[PDB]
Subunit: 30 residues, 4 copies
């Protein structure tokens, strides 16, 4: 269970991260 719960959480974290990137990518235009 915990294994499948970490992979779910880690996916969450990864999707949170990709938000941050695209925002940062847009800012790089500025």
């Amino acid at each position: 269970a915990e294994a499948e719960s970490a992979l779910e959480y880690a996916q969450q974290a990864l999707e949170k991260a990709q938000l941050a990137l695209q925002a940062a990518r847009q800012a790089l235009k500025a």
Copy 2:
């Protein structure tokens, strides 16, 4: 500026993604 906060946010999210993933790989060997 925002790209700052976006990049810092992203790095954190990956660490949470990393440490969780490490628990997961551990469960597999169990």
Copy 3:
């Protein structure tokens, strides 16, 4: 400029991290 290439590189790496992770979560339910 380099931050450009660094950000683009990072976004790609996360996608490879994402799609692999999706295969992994799938194996768990098996």
Copy 4:
């Protein structure tokens, strides 16, 4: 096996990504 091989690869990708971030973070100083 494949499950434990994806998590290994996804960890690789995550570590590749974190290189890209820190480089990008330093560039943000400029």
